[PDB]
């Protein structure tokens, strides 16, 4: 039974190293992955690799041998390394939340305000301060318990049980974990509220129109380009190429950049908006609407034209009358539902509720944000039991046995392998992992 545990544990060490080197090397090799967010994730992956190389193996040995055998120096050092990693980890996540926050409330949404170089220094500082507040307490013996049972473990080279004074337990916890955890959760839940609230029509259309820079066909059959920008309803491909070159003013040959695409997209919307104001049957309803459903109304016009969207007189009767639930039924009773249901669903909900809840986590950088949300939430769930129970030991001396402290600590250890797996959400990281694993 001791043996099975040792396989389980060995598997873990390898999962942390395999996982984390795979994260670190990807970022090292591919210049596309070198961003401010991915610089911090490297420092996060380093702490997990140092955890997996230095902390975890020696813990497993300590458990199974039932005694420390590495000499009191590496006992003290093993601890400071271990404390250093948990402190550097949580404070990196905190910094990542703040970097996200200042990104999303800038005019450059989703892009960091830090430079690559200024970022590198933020990482060094985190480690410098973390190192000092992890090591000095430990090496200067300031952590040490005064009572006898502890003092017997100190002067023994084969006892490495972690014993600390009440005041250290509190002071180390608040600064090492509670402060950054709290700032992280506060800030990042606002980074989610910023994204949701800062959704405009441009992202909304991008989400359910897609983007292609080569010429393609819509489900109607006609030639389209960019973000759902029709070129012609003529079946001749050269006619499409001709209408594109006419639009941009360049010999594209079916190839355009995002620059040329988003300029078209902006012209397309403004005209779709102009068209709603010009049309007599639509304009009255548009003034009636809040900013959100205003965008829901342009979304249709973009797709079906000013004429067509002026066809749904009943839907427009009831939207003018604010009966969102009633208008959604009639919009369901339409060929538009039958032709494109996934878009219809999303657009109808927006009319229904009046919120972006049908479009959450749909945009790319909104998926990028959720992934970052998932690593943060997991680290919380992995350590919070351990850290709370650590504080409840200091308040109530007898509630917390050895077995529980070690087990809870070990859910925290298991956290060092999860991040690489969670990055497989990112199709940037997924493509990277396969290339490196030569699949
Ligand atoms: C084992 C313990 C005691 C020592 C490990 C700490 C040092 C060597 C490591 C841990 C994390 C590392 C950083 C991780 C992030 C990278 C970003 C990269 O673009 C430049 C180097 C930089 C900034 C690293 C510098 C060295 C670093 C701070
Ligand atoms: C006792 C043991 C665990 C100490 C060894 C710590 C190792 C894992 C640390 C020390 C220095 C670190 C490296 C410092 C330089 C950076 C360059 C960056 O672009 C990719 C990560 C990389 C390459 C770091 C990866 C992790 C690293 C190699
Ligand atoms: C109060 C100590 C708990 C603690 C505080 C700050 C940073 C890390 C902390 O705990 C990490 C654990 O992995 C320690 N494990 C011990 C050393 C066996």
Curated annotation (Swiss-Prot):
Membrane topology: Multi-pass membrane protein
Family recorded in the similarity comment: Belongs to the G-protein coupled receptor 1 family. Adrenergic receptor subfamily. ADRB2 sub-subfamily.
Single annotated GO MF: norepinephrine binding
Broad class of the protein's primary localization: membrane
Record's comment on post-translational modification: Palmitoylated. Mainly palmitoylated at Cys-438. Palmitoylation may reduce accessibility of phosphorylation sites by anchoring the receptor to the plasma membrane. Also undergoes transient, ligand-induced palmitoylation at Cys-362 probably by ZDHHC9, ZDHHC14 and ZDHHC18 within the Golgi. Palmitoylation at Cys-362 requires phosphorylation by PKA and receptor internalization and stabilizes the receptor. Could be depalmitoylated by LYPLA1 at the plasma membrane. Phosphorylated by PKA and BARK upon agonist stimulation, which mediates homologous desensitization of the receptor. PKA-mediated phosphorylation seems to facilitate phosphorylation by BARK.
Protein name: Beta-2 adrenergic receptor
Lipidation (S-palmitoyl cysteine): 362, 438
Binding partners and assembly: Binds NHERF1 and GPRASP1. Interacts with ARRB1 and ARRB2. Interacts with SRC. Interacts with USP20 and USP33. Interacts with VHL; the interaction, which is increased on hydroxylation of ADRB2, ubiquitinates ADRB2 leading to its degradation. Interacts with EGLN3; the interaction hydroxylates ADRB2 facilitating VHL-E3 ligase-mediated ubiquitination. Interacts (via PDZ-binding motif) with SNX27 (via PDZ domain); the interaction is required when endocytosed to prevent degradation in lysosomes and promote recycling to the plasma membrane. Interacts with CNIH4. Interacts with ARRDC3.
Domain of life: Eukaryota
GO CC list: apical plasma membrane; ciliary basal body; cilium; clathrin-coated endocytic vesicle membrane; early endosome; endosome; endosome membrane; Golgi apparatus
Residues that coordinate or bind (S)-timolol: 82, 87, 390, 409, 413
Keywords, alphabetical: Cell membrane, Disulfide bond, Endosome, G-protein coupled receptor, Glycoprotein, Golgi apparatus, Hydroxylation, Lipoprotein, Membrane, Palmitate, Phosphoprotein, Receptor, Transducer, Transmembrane, Transmembrane helix, Ubl conjugation
């Amino acid at each position: 039974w001791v043996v099975g545990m040792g396989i389980v544990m060995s598997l873990i060490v390898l999962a942390i190293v395999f996982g984390n080197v795979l994260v670190i090397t990807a970022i090292a090799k591919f210049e596309r992955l070198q961003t401010v967010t991915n610089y911090f994730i490297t420092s996060l992956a380093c702490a997990d690799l140092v955890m997996g190389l230095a902390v975890v193996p020696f813990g497993a040995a300590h458990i199974l041998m039932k005694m420390w055998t590495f000499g009191n120096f590496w006992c003290e050092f093993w601890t400071s390394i271990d404390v250093l990693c948990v402190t550097a980890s949580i404070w990196t996540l905190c910094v990542i939340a703040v970097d996200r926050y200042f990104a999303i409330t800038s005019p450059f949404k989703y892009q960091s305000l830090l430079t690559k170089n200024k970022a590198r220094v933020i990482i060094l500082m985190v480690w410098i301060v973390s190192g000092l507040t992890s090591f000095l307490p430990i090496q200067m013996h300031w952590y040490r318990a005064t009572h006898q049972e502890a003092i017997n473990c100190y002067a023994e080279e084969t006892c490495c049980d972690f014993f600390t004074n009440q005041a250290y337990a509190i002071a180390s916890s608040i600064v090492s974990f509670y402060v950054p955890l709290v700032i992280m959760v506060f800030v990042y839940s606002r980074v989610f509220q910023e994204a949701k609230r800062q959704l405009n029509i441009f992202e909304m259309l991008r989400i359910d129109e897609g983007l292609r820079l080569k010429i393609y066909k819509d489900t109607e059959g006609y030639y389209t380009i960019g973000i759902g920008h029709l070129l012609t309803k003529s079946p001749s491909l050269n006619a499409a190429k001709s209408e594109l070159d006419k639009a941009i003013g360049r010999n594209t040959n079916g190839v355009i950049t995002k620059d040329e695409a988003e300029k078209l997209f902006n012209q397309d919307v403004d005209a779709a908006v102009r068209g709603i104001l010009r049309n007599a049957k639509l304009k009255p309803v548009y003034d009636s609407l809040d900013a959100v459903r205003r965008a829901a109304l342009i979304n249709m016009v973009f797709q079906m034209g000013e004429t067509g969207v002026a066809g749904f007189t009943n839907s427009l009767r009831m939207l003018q009358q604010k009966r969102w639930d009633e208008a959604a039924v009639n919009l369901a009773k339409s060929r538009w539902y039958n032709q494109t249901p996934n878009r219809a669903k999303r657009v109808i909900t927006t009319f229904r509720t009046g919120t972006w809840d049908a479009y959450k986590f749909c945009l790319k950088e909104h998926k990028a944000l959720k992934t970052l949300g998932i690593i943060m939430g997991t680290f919380t769930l992995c350590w919070l039991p351990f850290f709370i129970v650590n504080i409840v030991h200091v308040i109530q001396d007898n509630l917390i046995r050895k077995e529980v402290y070690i087990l809870l600590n070990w859910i925290g250890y298991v956290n060092s392998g999860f991040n690489p797996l969670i990055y497989c959400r990112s199709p940037d990281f997924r493509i990277a992992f396969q290339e490196l694993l030569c699949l």
